[PDB]
Structures are given as C-alpha cells and as structure tokens.
Amino acid sequence: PTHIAICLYYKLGETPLPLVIETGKDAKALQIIKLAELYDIPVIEDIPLATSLYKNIHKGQYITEDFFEPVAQLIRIAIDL
C-alpha cells in the first residue's frame, strides 16, 4: 500500500520476541503516524522493513526469524533516543 505503519511492542520478560500489536495501511497508517507523534512514541522510516512486516506479520503475531535482527536494531535505535 502507499502508506504502512507497524506498531511493535517488546517488554523484557513478557514478550519473548517483539510483538506486532497494531498495523495500518493508507488512512489508518497515517492516523497511527500522527497519533504516535502526539503521544511521543518513536516513529522510524524504514521502507523495506515496514513493507515486509506488513506483508508477513499480522496484527497480534510475534515477528518471525527473518525479522529478529532488523527489528532488534530498530528497537535499539528507538531506545537509544
């Protein structure tokens, strides 16, 4: 889709792997991105990773092996802020 937003959740001890808790395309994606800023949640532009997550990991699912390293990196960039 033209717009994609993937919301990832990780909490040490609770989520063994990062969890996709919310997703959106097009209007809903734009709403997620705007509300994220409003609520001070880090938003990273990563076209390939967002696109592949959207295609492969549905809302409510843990990420799979192919995504472990790139998403771990994403989280550390976000957490480093």
Binding site: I4, I6, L8, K28, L35, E45, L53
Partner: peptide, 19 residues
C-alpha cells in the same frame, strides 16, 4: 472511524515503523 483501542495500542508501543 478509528477503533476504541487504537490510541491505547499506540501509547503502549515500543516503536512504530513506517514506509
């Protein structure tokens, strides 16, 4: 019209990735 859970899910998120 957004679902009632959208805002809570965003606020809970560790990071959001976009295209």
């Amino acid at each position: 019209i957004q679902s009632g859970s959208l805002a809570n899910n965003i606020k809970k998120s560790t990071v959001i990735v976009k295209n």
